[PDB]
């Protein structure tokens, strides 16, 4: 599916709303492409900026470990 579809209404510029932002990160703490998030470019740009900001604030992980083979 898509991350946007698997979500209600929310703000993209909210750099503290961790519960929604975590939905846009893969198993590893990496930003998902538009292929997965299902956003327009402007939306993707704003989301990536916010993600980086939250990363700095320590709320979101820069990197992590995938628990598989």
């Amino acid at each position: 599916a898509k991350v946007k579809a698997t979500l209600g209404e929310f703000d993209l510029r909210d750099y503290r709303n961790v519960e929604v932002l975590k939905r846009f990160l893969s198993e590893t703490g990496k930003i998902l492409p538009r292929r997965r998030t299902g956003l327009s470019a402007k939306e993707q740009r704003i989301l990536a900026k916010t993600i980086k900001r939250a990363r700095i604030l320590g709320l979101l992980p820069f990197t992590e470990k995938l628990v598989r083979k």
Binding site: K65, L66, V67, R68, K69
Partner: protein, 119 residues
């Protein structure tokens, strides 16, 4: 001796070698083995079979120190990754978690000439 009975395993998988290091929860290594320790030299060290024997040998030693179960962490993307995981899985230790921990730069130091040309 240590009789920790529960530790973890670090599998450094390279293109040239595979090294398995068994360790306590605290991270202090207890025993280790590689492709070279078995007796292989040169390119033979890189083979998946070498990785299998390395994993089995390290596991046997760790059992001799009285372990029962580990938590395997794999680093690198060499040719002995899956073979080492499989070997350690059925060696008798009760592996609980398999974790990928490949350390990659965030576009840091400039790589060697052979590894450059990357877009």
């Amino acid at each position: 001796k240590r009789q920790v009975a529960s530790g973890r395993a670090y599998i450094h998988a390279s293109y040239n070698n595979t090294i398995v290091t068994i360790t306590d929860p605290d991270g202090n290594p207890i025993t280790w083995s590689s492709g070279g320790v078995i007796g292989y030299k040169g390119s033979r060290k890189g083979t998946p079979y070498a990785a299998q024997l390395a994993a089995l040998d390290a596991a046997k030693k760790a059992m001799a120190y009285g372990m029962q179960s580990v938590d395997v962490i794999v680093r690198g993307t060499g040719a002995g990754r899956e073979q080492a995981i499989r070997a350690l899985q059925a060696s008798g230790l009760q592996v609980k978690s398999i974790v990928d921990d490949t350390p990659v730069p965030h576009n840091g130091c400039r790589p060697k000439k052979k590894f450059r040309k990357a877009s």
